Design a protein that fits this description.
- The complex is a heterotrimer, with 2 copies of chain A and 1 copy of chain B.
- Chain A is built from no helices and 13 strands.
- Chain A is mainly β.
- Chain A folds into 2 domains: 65 residues, Complement Module, domain 1 (Ribbon); 59 residues, Complement Module, domain 1, CATH 2.10.70.
- In chain A, the strands form 5 sheets. Chain A has a 4-stranded antiparallel β-sheet with strand order 2-4-6-7, with no helix packed on it. In chain A, strands 9-10-12 form a 3-stranded antiparallel β-sheet, with no helix packed on it. In chain A, strands 1-3 form a two-stranded antiparallel sheet.
- The relative contact order of chain B is 0.13.
- By secondary structure, chain B is an all-alpha fold.
- Chain B is globular and about 50 Å long.
- Classes of the chains: A mainly beta, B mainly alpha.
- Chains in contact: A-B, A-C, B-C.
- The interface between A and C is medium-sized, with 18 and 17 residues.
- Bound molecules: 2-acetamido-2-deoxy-alpha-D-glucopyranose (2 copies) and zinc ion (ZN) (2 copies).
- The site of one 2-acetamido-2-deoxy-alpha-D-glucopyranose (NDG) has 3 residues of chain B, from α9.
- Chain C: It is found in: Cell membrane.
- Chain C: It comes from Homo sapiens.
- Chain C: Belongs to the receptors of complement activation (RCA) family.
- Chain C: This is Complement receptor type 2.
């Protein structure tokens, strides 16, 4: 049967318990200690895009030591708006976007405020007509 | 049941912290809203209007001292923001928009926060930091059916700020639909007359109080004139005022009379400890009845200021 | 950086010559001999979804023996609308859809007209309401 290999590790974090072999459809959950903040989506899904090999559906998220002083500027996406998360934007906070009518999204819809005061592991999504 | 001296005692000077200030601001705001809407200043004394506008501005200005960076509110700036207080500020401020200068960044910033931070994917609004004056939230103090009761309460607030904020808050339309979907899907299961009245009004505003829902709403009334919950039925004036607003919204004029009559027999101008919601709501509802009356013969009762 | 392994084979078809190794971003093209019709996307892209594994973005398309009588009816998707494709739909022809305002698409946006008159390799795409309670 199709499987995924060992999930990507996470420094200063934990990965939920999983059985072997890792079957398509398996969901893994990452988390961080109390003084750390998780940056990126917490659950990875074992999927198959070509019906032959298995891959996790996204990169593993990371744990950043908490920086109570960090703050990210308002994330703005022309053609779109926020459907989750609002100011102030602190370390570990997340924002989720949606595109206005007649606009379609490109890229990941959610971003995280990182310790270096910049948004998510990926670039802000874009909205095009 | 109402006259000028009785209404005049509701014009008060606001003071206190983030919750206390709104308890004070409520009677004055609804009293002015009621007199303007019913066009009764001639009976009350139009020269008192200016003075009331000044107290309203004072209430508003003072409340800003408790506005947080998030645009949400709490009793004290050191305290975690209340979903309910923030929504109540929106409910009061929305009524004052053409009374004094209300900053849309303030009004709409609070609306935006409610949606972006306190509404679940399923549409339910959640309170993560309950207010200290549990006295001021009326029927919501009884935590039973809180997801439905609070969701209706916040949605009604959002509807008041919709036209003013829809431009600056793109998530507003979708938030309302989600809240509405949740209330509609779970309405039939309500047990309290209070929740039935408040969610009933919220659904009526969206044209969703129909069929079995409408029937439950109407049949829930006791003696066909009030929505009350046995054992500490202190929320009946508030519940029934929401219900009267739903009936007016539905133009269900044949069912309205016993309700207005019951409301008019209550000492609804009493004010006093814990009267914030009853006060805001009964004056909103009776003002709405009088505002609608000139267009519909069926709303013929006299619930106006008497000599 | 990352590379994709040997691509899936295609019966009664061939893959455009590609150089080795295969880096992410590389596109390869499948085609069928002339007495067959290609069902599925002809271009496969080497991508990485988790920054560790390199994979082909779709399964290899297939070659169906040509049937000149095959004719697929106009595909309809609730909450969606056609973006590409025009009648009549013959063997190997395809159409593409998009979801309307307030729906998200579940499935592949493009389908192919098969010899048996049924649409694409996958089930027609579906457009589901953005609103959970629907
Ligand atoms: C809100 C908005 O921009 N909607 C318009 C709609 O009015 C129009 O009918 C359609 C035609 O393609 O384009 C967009 O969907
Ligand atoms: C084309 C269409 O259905 N647009 C609707 C809009 O009318 C509505 O206000 C909103 C929230 O329910 O959802 C969608 O944006
Ligand atoms: Zn925005
Ligand atoms: Zn947040």
């Amino acid at each position: 049967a199709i499987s995924c290999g060992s999930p990507p590790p996470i420094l200063n974090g934990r990965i939920s318990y999983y059985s072997t072999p890792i079957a398509v459809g398996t969901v893994i959950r990452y988390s961080c200690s109390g003084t750390f903040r998780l940056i990126g989506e917490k659950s990875l899904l074992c999927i198959t895009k070509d019906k032959v090999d298995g891959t996790w559906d996204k990169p593993a998220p990371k744990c950043e030591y908490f920086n109570k002083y960090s703050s990210c500027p308002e994330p703005i996406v022309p053609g779109g708006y926020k459907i989750r998360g609002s100011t102030p934007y602190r370390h570990g906070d997340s924002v989720t976007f949606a595109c206005k009518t007649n606009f379609s999204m490109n890229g990941n819809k959610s971003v995280w405020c990182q310790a270096n005061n910049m948004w998510g592991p990926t670039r802000l999504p874009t909205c095009v007509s | 049941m109402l006259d000028a001296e009785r209404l005049k005692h509701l014009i008060v000077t606001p003071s206190g912290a983030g919750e206390q200030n709104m308890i004070g601001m409520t009677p004055t705001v609804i009293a002015v809203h009621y007199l303007d809407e019913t066009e009764q200043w001639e009976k009350f004394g139009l020269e008192k209007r200016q003075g009331a506008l000044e107290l309203i501005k004072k209430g508003y200005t003072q409340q800003l001292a408790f506005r947080q960076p998030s645009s949400a509110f709490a009793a004290f700036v050191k305290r975690a923001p209340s979903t309910w207080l923030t929504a109540y500020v929106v409910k009061v401020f929305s009524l004052a928009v053409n009374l004094i200068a209300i900053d849309s960044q303030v009004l709409c910033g609070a609306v935006k926060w409610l949606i972006l931070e306190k509404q679940k994917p399923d549409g339910v609004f959640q309170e993560d930091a309950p207010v200290i004056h549990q006295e001021m939230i009326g029927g919501l103090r009884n935590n039973n059916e809180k997801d439905m009761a609070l969701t209706a309460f916040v949605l009604i607030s959002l509807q008041e700020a919709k036209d003013i904020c829809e431009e600056q808050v793109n998530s507003l339309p979708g938030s309302i639909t989600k809240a509405g979907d949740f209330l509609e899907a779970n309405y039939m299961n309500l047990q309290r007359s209070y929740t039935v009245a408040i969610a009933g009004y919220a659904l009526a505003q969206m044209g969703r109080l129909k069929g079995p829902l409408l029937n439950k709403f109407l049949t829930t009334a006791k003696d066909k004139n009030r929505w009350e919950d046995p054992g500490k039925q202190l929320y009946n004036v508030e519940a029934t005022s929401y219900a009267l607003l739903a009936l007016l919204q539905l133009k269900d004029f044949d069912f309205v009379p016993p309700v207005v009559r019951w409301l008019n027999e209550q000492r609804y101008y009493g004010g006093g400890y814990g009267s914030t919601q009853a006060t805001f709501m009964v004056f909103q509802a009776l003002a709405q009845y009088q505002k609608d009356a000139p267009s519909d013969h069926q709303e013929l009762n006299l619930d106006v200021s008497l000599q």
